[PDB]
Amino acid sequence: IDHKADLAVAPLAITYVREKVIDFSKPFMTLGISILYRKPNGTNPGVFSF
Amino acid sequence: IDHKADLAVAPLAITYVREKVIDFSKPFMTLGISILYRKPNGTNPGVFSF
Numbered sequence: 257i258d259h260k261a262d263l264a265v266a267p268l269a270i271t272y273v274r275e276k277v278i279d280f281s282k283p284f285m286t287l288g289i290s291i292l293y294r295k296p297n298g299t300n301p302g303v304f305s306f
Numbered sequence: 307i308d309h310k311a312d313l314a315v316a317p318l319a320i321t322y323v324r325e326k327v328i329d330f331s332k333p334f335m336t337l338g339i340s341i342l343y344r345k346p347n348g349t350n351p352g353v354f355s356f
């Protein structure tokens with residue numbers, strides 16, 4: 257906003273508030289919110305696993 | 307291009323050639339190429355499968 261730079265090549269996510277002030281190009285990468293979880297292990301099937 | 311319209315609210319996919327001629331907004335829907343395939347039909351091998 258202060259013209260101390262020319263581009264902003266970075267993980268700068270396009271949102272409502274930033275678009276109202278500065279201008280973005282079209283997205284070079286799209287994404288979202290996802291879930292981390294520990295990969296299953298199978299070292300405990302229960303004691304009546306037979 | 308002939309100014310016989312004002313907007314183009316439609317499934318008009320942003321590509322290289324169309325962007326060089328007309329101007330698009332930022333995407334309201336993102337997508338890609340995916341695969342149709344028939345859902346697995348269970349494969350019951352009969353009731354006398356033993």
Ligand SMILES: CCCCCCCC/C=C\CCCCCCCC(=O)O[C@@H](COC(=O)CCCCCCCCCCCCCCC)COP(=O)([O-])OCC[N+](C)(C)C
Pocket residue numbers: 351352353354355
């Ligand atoms: C482990 C140690 C050994 C113990 C056992 C030793 C004994 C041997 C025991 C059993 C032997 C069985 C023979 C094999 C049959 C093939 C199976 C089949 O595909 O047919 C079908 C079964 O229906 C039938 O079985 C029709 C067979 C015709 C008559 C055979 C028995 C004769 C009767 C007595 C005369 C005997 C002579 C006289 C005796 C005094 C199965 O169909 P499917 O393909 O699985 O799927 C369904 C198909 N569908 C969806 C289209 C409906």
